């Protein structure tokens, strides 16, 4: 009973939180070190 309440809450809460992790992970995954200073020589 009241399934629609638990369902609605859990669906969107975990979806938003999961996406926040995905986006944060993306931003960290592709962190730009600058590709300078010593990178030009090591490359």
């Amino acid at each position: 009973l009241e399934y629609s309440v638990v369902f609605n809450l859990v669906l969107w809460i975990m979806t938003g939180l999961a996406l926040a992790v995905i986006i944060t992970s993306y931003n960290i995954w592709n962190m730009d070190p600058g590709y300078d200073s010593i990178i030009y020589r090591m490359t």
Partner: protein
Amino acid sequence: NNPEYSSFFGVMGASSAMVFSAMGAAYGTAKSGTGIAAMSVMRPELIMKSIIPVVMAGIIAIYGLVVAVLIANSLTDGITLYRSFLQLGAGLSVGLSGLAAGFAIGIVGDAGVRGTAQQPRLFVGMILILIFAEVLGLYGLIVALILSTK
């Protein structure tokens, strides 16, 4: 009388408090580390001063650790749901606020350390800016504690 599934919210809180704040500290440390490497090769004499952004980043992760434990030690099977919701909100408040702080710490650390390599007078200003980012993390901790004990 207790709605089953109620614990799900509080449990996600305890995890979220650590996971999101960990990503923040991870960004802060990783972003600062690159800036440190650039400075140190140019001049290693500052290697023991440019580490500070990293220590600060760690403190953010601790903020999250503290709440995550407080929530976990506040879980029960016969949970009244109200408290479970507060725990979720408290965990997210510190986790996501620390996450924002982590980005703030990393960006300014890299810029500050790279600048300091050229201008030693930049150090003091860098620290003050880093202080604001640590304060941004603390505000999250304060609210999370208020909610989790409410």
